[PDB]
């Protein structure tokens, strides 16, 4: 009702700011539509009552302070809305979502609506634990420096006995990878029960680590129907002296995740986050919530790893967007860059950074690009597309490890992985018979540069 559009108001360093992509119904002026989201996300669409004597509650009014039409688009704009600090419960993403994205997406007067970004102020961020451990803290817990970490996807996805899963995990670790993933869908099930899986996976990590002399770990899936159960499984992992666990945060929910992240700091277990059911919310450019926000949310309700998908078969518009939220997950200060989809400057106030996890159809030939694009702070998750290694899992591991050492070594010399990336692996395959079989199993790629 147009007391919520105040463009002369400068936002405070303590305000929570939102960047909604508003798509009003034809005929609906931008000014009204902007001020609809302000009122229907912040406080009630004001219901005037006899108590206007007691009630000067203007302080809790969220408001649109800038209205910016999206160029190249059909009657669309960005509403920059500012909510005061006091609206929100401390340390509660669940409340942040309830307040901001709660009811406003169900207008009729808008065709569609997407929340692109949230500026979480410093003073609000200090009320969250954030990641159980940093990037740095994780690398100190594991003794692993100067390179990406390597993970393994067990296959087939579903149906394996607990013992099978453990034999599978033993090899993939034994063959030179750091982590092994428990599939997101794999929570306790009639074909495979959780306590059995956890037990045999532990037998494997113990052995593989002893034989190799590198700290090994498996993302055990504590995702579960109830907090009671989730924590029960975290506790059994912890009882088995396990370095790391995993959790499907969106499906399970933020209330249940924030509990788990804190539990994870209290017991010093690493937390590997999976983003299943992101694509339901974060895909359509006109309506939903950008993953950017769900990434920022996971950094606040805690996590140590988070899947960012892959940036390899995606164009340079979308690469910039993916490396914008990988910057938000890992860095302390991220400058406003709207080309990349970062609508606000975000100062994290020394909150620990989350390691970005790359997964997709990736195989040995993707290594040079991945090392170049992401950098050292990342986890490279192999075995994920239509790809097998025909000797077993440990051979398949060895291939990737030899491949990764090669590129990291090469980059450190001064070699350009952009051009010589494929040569580096070819060179590597001469001495390693496991990489040789792998290299010939997938077609390589070279260089198809960018422009902007």
């Amino acid at each position: 009702r147009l007391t919520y559009y105040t463009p002369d108001y400068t936002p405070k360093d303590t305000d929570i700011l939102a960047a909604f992509r508003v798509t009003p119904q034809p005929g609906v002026p931008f000014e009204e539509a902007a001020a609809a989201v302000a009122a229907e996300s912040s406080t009630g669409t004001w219901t005037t009552v006899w108590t206007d004597l007691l009630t000067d509650l203007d302080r809790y009014k969220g408001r649109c302070y800038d209205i910016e039409p999206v160029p190249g688009e059909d009657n669309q704009f960005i509403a920059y809305i500012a909510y005061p600090l006091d609206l929100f419960e401390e340390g509660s993403i669940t409340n942040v979502l309830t307040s901001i994205v709660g009811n406003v997406f169900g207008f009729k007067a808008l065709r569609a609506l997407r929340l692109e970004d949230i500026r979480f102020p410093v003073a609000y961020i200090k009320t969250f634990q954030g990641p159980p451990h940093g990037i740095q803290v994780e690398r100190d817990k594991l003794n692993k420096y100067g390179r990406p970490l390597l993970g393994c996807t067990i296959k087939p996805k579903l149906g394996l006995s607990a013992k099978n899963y453990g034999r599978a995990v033993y090899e993939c670790l034994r063959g030179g990878l750091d982590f092994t993933k428990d599939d997101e869908n794999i929570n306790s099930a009639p074909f495979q029960r959780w306590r059995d899986r956890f037990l045999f996976v532990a037998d494997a990590i113990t052995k593989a680590q002893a034989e190799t002399g590198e700290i090994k770990g498996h993302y055990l899936n504590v995702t579960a129907p109830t907090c009671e159960e989730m924590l029960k499984r975290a506790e059994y992992a912890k009882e088995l002296k396990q370095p790391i666990i995993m959790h499907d945060y969106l499906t399970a929910g933020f209330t249940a995740n924030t509990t788990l992240a804190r539990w994870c700091r209290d017991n010093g277990v690493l937390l590997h986050i999976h983003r299943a059911m992101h694509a339901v919310i974060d895909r359509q450019k006109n309506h939903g919530i950008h993953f950017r926000v769900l990434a920022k949310a996971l950094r606040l309700s805690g996590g140590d790893h988070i899947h960012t998908g892959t940036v390899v078969g995606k164009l340079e518009g979308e690469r910039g967007i993916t490396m914008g939220f990988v910057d938000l997950l890992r860095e302390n200060y991220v400058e406003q860059d709207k080309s990349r989809g970062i609508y606000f400057t975000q100062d994290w106030a020394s909150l620990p950074g989350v390691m970005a996890v790359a997964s997709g159809g990736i195989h040995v030939w993707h290594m040079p690009a991945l090392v170049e694009i992401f950098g050292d702070d990342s986890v490279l998750q192999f075995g994920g597309g239509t790809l097998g290694h025909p000797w077993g899992n440990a051979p398949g591991a060895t291939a990737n490890r030899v491949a990764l050492e090669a590129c990291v070594q090469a980059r450190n010399e001064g070699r350009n992985l952009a051009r010589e990336g494929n040569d580096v692996i070819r060179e590597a395959a001469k001495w390693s018979p496991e990489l040789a079989v792998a290299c010939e199993l997938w077609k390589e790629i070279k260089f198809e540069f960018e422009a902007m």
Partner: protein, 203 residues
């Protein structure tokens, strides 16, 4: 179907039986319709459902969409370079309800553009085919073909937009710091340039 309760129940059973396309799945619902149908007009409707002689195929109906906007057909005066005279000659288009038809007798070129609010807002729109280097260079990209739409009924000056002008018997696009005496034939409303192994999930 009458407004007898028995008919109403038989109608429910009828309506629900029609979505099932296999006769075994339709047995519970027919048996009900027969048990309940009061008029003989209804009992036939139920009885029809027993056959599986092929029927009247449901014709390919698509919906008048009031959800999305409809396209607009726009006249094309040709490729720039062009004369003021050729743009003046293309008549105002009259869209014939109810399907927004356009009939025309002489020689003309046409394009279907999407229903963009601006384009729908235009009282008289016309298309001109030019290159991107007719306007300022925006980013690094090389000069390409552009389709330009102009509203001829928007001729009032301002400092924030482009206009088509009669450059002594020639068409030209320029912008103005100060309001001109040069003829303006319209206002530029739209510029547009010309318009796979991934079963891989974005995990």
């Amino acid at each position: 179907f009458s407004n007898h309760p028995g008919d109403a129940v038989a109608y429910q059973a009828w309506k629900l039986a029609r979505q099932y396309s296999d006769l075994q799945e339709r047995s519970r619902l027919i048996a009900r319709g027969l048990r309940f149908a009061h008029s003989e007009t209804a009992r036939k409707q139920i009885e029809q459902l027993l056959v599986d002689q092929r029927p009247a195929p449901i014709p390919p109906f698509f919906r008048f969409d009031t959800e999305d906007e409809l396209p607009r057909i726009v006249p094309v005066v040709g490729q720039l370079p062009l004369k003021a005279e050729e743009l003046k000659a293309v008549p105002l288009v009259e869209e014939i309800e109810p399907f927004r038809l356009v009939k025309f007798s002489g020689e003309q070129a046409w394009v279907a553009l999407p229903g963009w609010q601006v384009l729908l807002a235009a009282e008289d729109p016309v298309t001109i085919l030019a290159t991107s280097d007719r306007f300022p260079k925006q980013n690094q990209t090389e000069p390409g073909p552009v389709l330009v739409v102009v509203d001829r009924s928007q001729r009032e000056w301002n400092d924030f937009s482009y206009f088509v002008v009669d450059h002594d018997g020639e068409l030209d696009f320029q912008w103005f710091e100060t309001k001109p005496e040069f003829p303006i034939l319209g206002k530029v409303i739209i510029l547009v340039r010309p318009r796979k192994d991934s079963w891989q999930i974005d995990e």
